[PDB]
Design a protein around this ligand. Structure first.
Ligand SMILES: OC[C@H]1O[C@@H](O[C@H]2[C@H](O[C@@H]3[C@@H](O)[C@H](O)[C@@H](CO)O[C@H]3O)O[C@H](CO)[C@@H](O)[C@@H]2O)[C@H](O)[C@@H](O)[C@@H]1O
Ligand SMILES: OC[C@H]1O[C@@H](O)[C@H](O)[C@@H](O)[C@@H]1O
Ligand SMILES: [Mg+2]
Ligand SMILES: [Mg+2]
Lengths: 732, 745
């Protein structure tokens, strides 16, 4: 019984020792001896960790063991795709598997706590942290949040390969103005609950052990001092029973935000419901003084302390402080063949085929797609992402061995050895400006830029291209053009690369764009002029091999976008689940004076939410509804037959949207409410069935009551958010 | 008294007649929307019409008023509305340009003149001022407002209402104003006109609402509901806005009109059928139905069914009748129907002379670098210059009459305004030769050009190639001593339903500009625009840049005045000019964030900043140059510490350190350093426009009282908090002198 144990332990504790449980610092040995340390973060290596734990257990008065945290975001050493790429699998089993594998690996190396999952909704692709999330949609975001929490923690974190998760960043961090990381957030309460909050709630309701507070203000109060968020919503509305950790120096940053000095903002944080202080040392250096002056009560301190101690108890650390400190496990569990094969499979499943038009290859024959192709003849692999190992895994790969990942050229060479020649040319730098390239390739991602001019690089590339039968243009972002503090105001393939791509197309050889990116990009030029475009995001440590599997047809691409790809930055924010407005522009009517539309571009994204092609095609019959009417207690089934009408086996993500036609407040033109990923052989059919019940039709009204209102609903099922079949029913 | 008279009149009225007062059909030759009204004469006879709008001309208006007064049962006279936005026939600058005067007297004057002209021609009601705050230059309606700042916006709202209405609208040259668009319409997502608005209540009150409140406080007779949703409810059905804020909090005694088809647009918004949304509108506090016919066709059914009460109808009807009464229309229905006034009041030389003065005052000198014009002569700025030799005027805005007034000039005689070439030819006759070439089309794409030049603003695009156009212009430029490049937007690239996703000078014009620069002849960019543009390339390469917005009917002459040094530019920007559209929204009064980038530190990993451009606008709020220079000494604060009962004075000496007489807009910014909520890094709280001779100084003093330091806190309480404040005074929002004081209880 935890409460009795913790009561007894807390009876023994000084105020200094209770305070110390709340400290999560970046000397360290001295602090641990005095009981001033509740946990540590991003310390790598089971041996170092076991040694630090030893100090806590046997050289501090009470022997209270430490939490050891790390950003295990999309892998420990075996790297899966960046989360945004992973989300395009639309495969909750695979997602859970990826998190399970990462937990196995991290736990083997001493880690008991991951700062994952990141579930921040964003509709702004300028923000570099879209790479860490799961796109623009709350329903899908919520499903993913559950899958990740369950993957990490399992049922109750009792196993030694199960770790504590931490949903971040609570809340609304993805709506930062201008898409500039850390910038002001502002929105209505109604928008919070209908459009942003569901994934945080899903994590809490799946039993996530911890929550991390965000860097942004909400309603003019930094999240870290926002009691409405950290107590009233998180505990009061959602029943959260864990603890809240700040983000990095989150407390001291409130001084810069402009709401007071260190003591004042520290007191406000703890009274808001913040439990653990990451790096600031505002809790450890000011809380006693605040308790003496009456600004923080002993009851508040004890609650904060108690939540930390309960997390430690739930992880099994009081039973065994060294639960995660098995020196034999690393060789057994970390970077194994089985894990790496899982990563390669999931990587290939994450890729989104954006375009694959018919091209005239053989004279006189019908035109045919470039993808897939048989590896033979001379295959050119050209561009600054063609031969970089360190840029393959993606940002947020802090425990990965970067220079162990095969480059694309390396991986394709292996897979084609004896069947084709792989011809390499760098082609261009990452971007024209050298200073930009440096900051874009921070944290060990250098492309070894030298004194060769753009013109020299280009000329070499065209020599190689003109000796080839097909060109793989490996282009796009470096991995650190996304992640934290990596906001962009332009979302093109960088200048020199796009010029390279233009020049490769002019050789007359077939060109496949293999696009590396951590975010949506503005690709109208590429969509017009490049025959085949495969978005590979950043596929992880096995990316090169997975890309080969797609290119050669060993895997039929089935990924679907989870974030809208705009035509230009001037359309931001562009998202599928938008209100109709009072003056909707009808389909095909652009431009029309006095409708909601721009002078210079239509309203549409280049690629909408849920978009993704396959080497086969799928046909949808009409929707069958089991009932035309249901009441508040009823239910119906929406059924559609899906038929593989092409020549390839493949998967299709069948997507369910609902539109509430009339509301007491304005309602989106559609919302994702379900999906099923199916696999079909050529010629084969499957009746896909969705359950629809009133609980699915609920939303937060004007007074923030979560209600389904009677009236008509339109059910939409299809291959993406744009191309759908339609039927209607009535809620009575 | 009014109450007796109105009770009496309302005791005679059928339900249909009460509903009729709420009905505002459209008519006339003016187009400001899609839907059109039918059967108006018969509707007036049956008492089904409370007003009309878009009818131009005292003769037509008199006829219709006579139908209402003499041929309806009760003879209730009509309101006659028009968008009188920045002039009737004499056109002043577009409001965004006008705001750059920072001169409330001139602004009030411009409204006075518009009212004199509109009233002479039968109009009793203008749908003005438009006071929507915007931080998004994609939105075309920024041209209609006064920029990003609520303080300056509040002052302009008051000035405009006072100008139109006077003390109480009793005179025959005073008309009823209509503050618009209530509320938040300038925050439409993606800067796309009519799109979703969403924000916190704190942001509404601290950042967007003040100019509406200032109009109400100045006695504005009417309010127009906005097109957008607020908290998921279309503004036109938002009872919290239209009753609780507007009447409950602010004490507004007037009536609310919808925008054009605002009620039926609620169907598309998705909150119900015509009958349902009409009922919700009137129950929200909307009094008059522009075009939709929702009220007239469904309210009686709604009253029968109990969806709307008789008391609700009565209240709305009563507000309309009271507006008419306060305008003097029950006393004299023909008050604005004097058939002789147009010949003496409209487009007079005195009005046009005022417009010209006000237009030159509106221009913002963005750049005026020294140029070496002849070897061995020290470098001087291109502007101003003595008109002589050969002056080329080149570009698609060089010889266009119809584009000079700007958008929202629905009563102007477009082809009577002189083009820039014509204006400059008149002003330089006998002194200089004006050479001319169009140089380029407006934009490469003909279909864009067509929609960009609707409403009679064609540039007369012909079938010449870009090469024909360019070559003719280069033959002119190579013969000229100086080149005036008249480039930028057509007037209908801004205004309603004119949102842009790119904010450059259009492709073929920028190419023309590049080629003119390559001649080696000195180039002046005379920039026409209704919005902030992205001008980093122009700022790098063009020696002189004069933003002339759209100057009105006398723009050409006013431009000549600036160019030739008869007027020294003194405009300051009221909206931030971004370096690119990916920085949007960019605004001076921003929060610090928890990770502010220190000055001169771009780029720094883990600060709030972008990989590819710094955080700064190309030109900040309050930016603007002069033909002279001004220098500021240190700030003297009369006190270090005040309490809530107290006050202090901030003073600075401003000296004209250059060679030209000129005006400077001295701007006061205040920063509340610490708050219970995060406070902006600065907020404009005062300004004074001074005029100094060369070498002359003046001590500029600002009164600082705790009532200026209040803001809406977390609980939406308008309070000043004790603590430290920073006072900032300077020539723009960026380049400022600083001092500190403490507020105590
Ligand atoms: O890991 C805690 C927390 O870190 C926040 O980013 C910090 C960053 O911290 C990095 C850390 O993220 C990374 O995992 C390790 C290991 O490579 O290195 C640390 O230095 O550091 C800078 C300080 O230089 C901070 O500005 C930044 O905020 C993330 O925001 C958060 O998601 C993560 O959970
Ligand atoms: O003329 C009536 C109304 O016309 C509409 O087209 C405009 O949007 C309004 O701003 C104007 O006041
Ligand atoms: Mg409904
Ligand atoms: Mg303060």
């Amino acid at each position: 019984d935890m409460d009795r144990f913790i009561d007894a332990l807390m009876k023994k504790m000084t105020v200094e020792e209770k305070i110390g449980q709340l400290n999560l610092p970046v000397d360290i040995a001295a602090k641990i001896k005095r009981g001033e340390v509740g946990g540590l973060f991003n310390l790598k290596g089971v041996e170092k960790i076991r040694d630090v734990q030893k100090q806590a257990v046997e050289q501090s008065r009470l022997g209270i063991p430490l939490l050891f945290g790390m950003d295990v975001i999309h892998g420990y050493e075996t790297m899966f795709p960046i989360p945004l790429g992973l989300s395009c699998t639309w495969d909750m089993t695979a997602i859970e598997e990826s998190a399970r594998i990462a937990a196995i690996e991290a736990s083997a190396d001493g880690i008991s706590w991951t700062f994952s999952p990141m579930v921040d909704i964003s509709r702004d692709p300028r923000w570099g942290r879209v790479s860490e999330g799961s796109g623009e949609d709350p329903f899908l975001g919520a499903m993913i949040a559950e899958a990740m929490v369950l993957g990490y923690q399992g049922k109750d974190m009792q196993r030694n390969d199960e770790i504590m998760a931490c949903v971040k960043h609570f809340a609304l961090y993805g709506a930062g103005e201008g898409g500039r990381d850390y910038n002001t957030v502002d929105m209505s309460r109604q928008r919070m609950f209908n459009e942003y909050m569901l994934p945080y709630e899903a994590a809490v309701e799946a039993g996530v052990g911890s929550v991390m507070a965000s860097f942004n203000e909400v309603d003019g109060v930094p999240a870290t001092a926002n009691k409405w968020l950290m107590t009233d919503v998180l505990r009061g509305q959602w029943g959260f029973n864990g603890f809240v950790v700040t983000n990095y120096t989150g407390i001291s940053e409130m001084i810069d935000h402009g709401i007071g000095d260190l003591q004042t903002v520290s007191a406000r944080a703890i009274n808001a419901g913040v439990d653990m202080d990451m790096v600031s040392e505002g809790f450890v250096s000011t809380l006693k003084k605040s308790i003496q002056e009456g600004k923080v009560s002993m009851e508040t301190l004890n609650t904060a302390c108690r939540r930390i101690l309960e997390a430690k108890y739930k992880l099994g650390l009081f039973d065994n402080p060294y639960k995660y400190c098995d020196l034999k496990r690393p060789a057994r569990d970390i970077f194994t063949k089985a894990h790496r094969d899982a990563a390669r499979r999931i990587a290939a499943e994450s890729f989104v085929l954006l375009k694959n038009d018919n091209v005239t290859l053989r004279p006189g024959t019908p035109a045919e797609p470039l993808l897939p192709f048989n590896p033979k003849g001379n295959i050119a692999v050209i561009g600054p992402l063609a031969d970089s190992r360190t840029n393959m895994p993606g940002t947020w790969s802090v425990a990965a061995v970067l220079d162990r990942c095969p480059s694309l050229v390396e991986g394709l060479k292996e897979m084609t050895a004896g069947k084709a020649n792989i011809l390499y040319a760098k082609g261009s730098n990452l971007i024209s400006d050298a200073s930009y390239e440096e900051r874009a390739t921070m944290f060990g991602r250098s492309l070894n830029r030298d004194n060769r001019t753009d013109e020299q690089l280009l000329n070499e590339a065209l020599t190689v291209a003109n000796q080839s039968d097909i060109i793989i243009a490996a282009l796009g972002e470096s991995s650190e053009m996304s992640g934290e503090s990596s906001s962009r105001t332009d979302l093109n393939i960088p200048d020199v690369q796009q010029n390279l791509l233009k020049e490769l197309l002019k050789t007359g050889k077939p060109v496949v764009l293999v696009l590396f990116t951590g975010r949506p990009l503005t690709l109208t030029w590429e969509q017009e002029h490049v025959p085949a475009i495969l978005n590979v995001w950043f596929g992880g440590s096995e990316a090169a091999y997975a890309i080969g599997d797609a290119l050669f047809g060993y895997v039929n691409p089935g990924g679907k976008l989870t974030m809208s790809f705009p035509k230009n930055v001037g359309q931001i924010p562009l998202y599928y689940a938008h209100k109709n407005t009072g003056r909707p522009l009808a389909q095909g009517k652009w431009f029309e004076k006095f409708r909601s539309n721009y002078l210079d571009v239509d309203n549409e994204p280049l690629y909408p939410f849920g978009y993704g092609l396959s080497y086969t095609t799928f046909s949808y019959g009409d929707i069958d509804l089991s009932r035309s009417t249901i009441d508040m207690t009823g239910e119906l089934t929406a059924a559609v037959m899906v038929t593989n009408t092409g020549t390839w086996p493949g998967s299709e993500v069948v997507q369910l949207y609902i539109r509430d036609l009339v509301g007491s407040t304005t309602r989106p033109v559609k919302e994702l409410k379900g999906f099923q990923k199916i696999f079909l052989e050529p010629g084969q059919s499957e009746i896909v069935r969705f359950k629809i019940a009133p609980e699915m039709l609920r939303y937060y009204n004007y007074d923030l009551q979560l209600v389904a209102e009677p009236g008509e609903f339109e059910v939409m099922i299809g291959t993406n958010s744009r191309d759908v079949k339609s039927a209607r029913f009535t809620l009575k």
